[PDB]
């Protein structure tokens, strides 16, 4: 029948069916369990509503699944509650973060077949699905989500693992950063509940500056960059340089006390780590994906930082599709919908015969 596509995000799970232009369900990648009197599980929004009597967990904190009991809860919810289907009836395409350990990929496969009894299954790299979504098989993706951000160079459809760059900094950290400066200005943002207020402020008012210093000076000598936000308690916090200082972190991690390279540098390094005979293709196809790549000005800023690092001859092109927030999912949707892809679904017959290592 129809294939299922589940993008297991570190912050949000995007789920739906292959052939759709968008994910039917997108919910918080969280699982809550009864806290006292030692049902007995809640996923997504529900888990959040009832935080008061549950202990929440993040099974995919930084892109990698670290808790299998919890993950079984996400997938159960996805299937039966969100999509409302019997997993045994549909082949399932699952996405995984770049550099996911083999044993991890094998346990995901073990669960799908033994726990959810799916007829067929497949595991693809998120970044690669995003490139696919843009109509390319070669290119270099910059995927910045909630818990982690990756640089993934891809040639003829295959990711180049040795050149993959990882930055443990994404949207979640951008929110924690803005939350910090805001609490310092006097507005109390502490609880996770409250943090959701800041996150929303982030998404609606933050942007990337083409030149941090020029922008910084404008904010200091004018009020033309000021925007206002009404808090749920009625207060009207207004912000200026924190509007672009927050995202600036992606380019300068030191704002968060990290000595790691910024996203423009990690992209350059990832390129330079690749066969010199394909660097032009990468440079010409830098595709951005993920919710943290939605900031206004991020594309222009990348184009500037990269042209400055690469050789003057080089043609630098940054691709940032409007559906950026769902490129991965859409990549899987397109893939798992193809005709020629059907010979790719690891089947239970194959799994029952060779084992979990059949996935590689």
């Amino acid at each position: 029948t129809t294939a299922l596509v589940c993008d297991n995000g570190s912050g949000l799970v995007k789920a739906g069916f292959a052939g759709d232009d968008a994910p039917r369900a997108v919910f918080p990648s969280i699982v809550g369990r009864p806290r006292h009197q030692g049902k007995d599980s809640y996923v997504g929004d529900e888990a959040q509503s009832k935080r008061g009597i549950l202990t929440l967990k993040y099974p995919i904190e930084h892109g990698i699944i670290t808790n299998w009991d919890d993950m079984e809860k996400i997938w159960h919810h996805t299937f039966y509650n969100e999509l409302r289907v019997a997993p045994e009836e549909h082949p399932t395409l699952l996405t995984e973060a770049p550099l996911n350990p083999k044993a991890n990929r094998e346990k995901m496969t073990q669960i799908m077949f033994e726990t959810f009894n799916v007829p067929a299954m497949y595991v693809a790299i998120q970044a690669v699905l995003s490139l696919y979504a843009s109509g390319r098989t070669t290119g270099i993706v910059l995927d910045s989500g909630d818990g982690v951000t990756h640089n993934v160079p891809i040639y003829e459809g295959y990711a180049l693992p040795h050149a993959i760059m990882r930055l443990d900094l994404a949207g979640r950290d951008l929110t924690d950063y803005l939350m910090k400066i805001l609490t310092e200005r006097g507005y109390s943002f502490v609880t996770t509940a409250e943090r959701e207020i800041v996150r929303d402020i982030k998404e609606k008012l933050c942007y990337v500056a083409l030149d941090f210093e020029n922008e910084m000076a404008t904010a200091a000598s004018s009020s033309s960059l000021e925007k206002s936000y009404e808090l749920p308690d009625g207060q009207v916090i207004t912000i200026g340089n924190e509007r672009f200082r927050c995202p600036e972190t992606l380019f300068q991690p030191s704002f968060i006390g990290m000595e790691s390279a910024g996203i423009h540098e990690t992209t350059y390094n990832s390129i330079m780590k690749c066969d010199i005979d394909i660097r032009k293709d990468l440079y010409a196809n830098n595709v951005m994906s993920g919710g943290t790549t939605m900031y206004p000005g991020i594309a222009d800023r990348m184009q500037k930082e990269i042209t400055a690092l690469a050789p003057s001859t080089m043609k630098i092109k940054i691709i940032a599709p409007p559906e950026r927030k769902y490129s991965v999912w859409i990549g899987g949707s397109i893939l798992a919908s193809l005709s020629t892809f059907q010979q790719m679904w690891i089947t239970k017959q194959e799994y029952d015969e060779a084992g979990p290592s059949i996935v590689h």
Binding site: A22, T137, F341
Partner: peptide, 25 residues
């Protein structure tokens, strides 16, 4: 034997008209 599958798959991805994709919602 299977590279032809991948090969053809790569072709199907490069020529895929993103529409023809059921409008979710």
């Amino acid at each position: 034997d299977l590279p032809k599958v991948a090969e053809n798959l790569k072709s199907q991805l490069e020529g895929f008209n993103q529409d023809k994709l059921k409008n979710a919602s």
